[PDB]
């Protein structure tokens, strides 16, 4: 019904080509009913730093979000601060001041193609996310076990219904259907 979904996009140097990542967003978002009283969406991108592409309450319509999403530019990154990205989506994106609706389910979708440089506090961050009831769906572009394990751990139990594997940027799309319904 009503969920506040924050998408955490990896935009580090390694991600390529950006267009595939955005197509992934399009397909995913277009299947949704966005609205102040519907599904809300906010997008966060990370690399060396983190930036709030757009807040949870920025757009009141699905096309407004669909259009804003496609306008997102890759900011690159010599590092992959996955930990920072998720923590930022948690401590910031999900605050009432940025459109976090009171008492509404909080859902986070993470997409990345590399071992975070902040492996250390990824444990802590995912932890804080659990304490705050944030459903987490993670996706790993394998374009590998130590990596796959890192990402699955970012997902919520049951790992299997919250984790997605992809061969490369391109195949991301071939998951939006399952991802979409899994988050239902």
């Amino acid at each position, epitope marked *: 019904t009503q969920l506040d979904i924050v998408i955490v996009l990896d935009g580090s*140097n390694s991600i*390529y080509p950006w267009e595939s990542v955005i197509a992934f967003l399009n397909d995913l978002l277009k299947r949704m009913d966005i609205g102040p009283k519907q599904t809300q969406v906010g997008i966060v991108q990370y*690399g060396e730093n983190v930036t709030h592409e757009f807040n949870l309450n920025k757009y009141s319509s699905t096309e407004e979000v669909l259009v804003a999403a496609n306008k997102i530019v*890759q900011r*690159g990154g*010599r590092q*992959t601060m996955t930990a920072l990205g998720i923590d930022t989506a948690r401590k910031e994106a999900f605050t009432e001041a940025r459109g976090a609706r009171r008492g509404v389910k909080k859902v986070m979708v993470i997409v990345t193609d590399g071992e975070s440089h902040d*492996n*250390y506090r990824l444990k802590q961050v995912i932890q804080d996310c659990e304490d705050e009831n944030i459903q987490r769906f993670s996706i790993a572009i394998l374009g590998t076990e130590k990596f796959v394990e890192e990402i699955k751990s970012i997902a919520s139990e049951p790992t299997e219904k919250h984790f997605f594997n992809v061969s490369d940027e391109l195949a991301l799309v071939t998951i939006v259907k399952a991802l979409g319904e899994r988050i239902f």
Partner: T-cell receptor
Amino acid sequence: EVQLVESGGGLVQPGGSLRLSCAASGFTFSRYTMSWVRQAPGKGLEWVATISGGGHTYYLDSVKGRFTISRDNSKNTLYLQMNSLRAEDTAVYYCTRGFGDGGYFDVWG
Amino acid sequence: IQLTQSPSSLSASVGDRVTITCSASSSVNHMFWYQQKPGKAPKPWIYLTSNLASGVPSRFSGSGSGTDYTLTISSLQPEDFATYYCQQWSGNPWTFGQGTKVEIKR
């Protein structure tokens, strides 16, 4: 195998310029973030600049604004335009393919 | 982040066990190593801390975490004689250590 073949080195006068090119072959060049690394006479290794598969360029402070890293995926050649060269700049330069966000130097010229 | 290797120089005879230490001013998730032989360009030797490049003979091994990392040659060979550099990618600018030169003690 894979490889980078550099050319463009030489002698320039303090404050002048020059341009190194590096021909890539053996891999899908466009996807990797490439870099330039230098080694001064009797010195170690120094990261000069980097350009991602998407066009983001990065630079060591000392060469910031004096150097320009670019690429032309049409001809899988990487470039390092160097202007306002100073003495500190003298060294042997290596283009380099990177792994991941490019910090690991996969292949060298 | 600054990387300082030790020793900076070391002489050893074939068969000796060598261990280069790379200390970083700040902690990092991994460390990389390059092997440069005189007159040639550096060569990827050990990535992601312990992973050996493609050519690197199995006698080579890398290890570490936080601020202290290490490259080890269990059985020094007359061919392993070159200078090794550790490098980090966790902080900007990316940096190398001063390098550690290893010559054949005969």
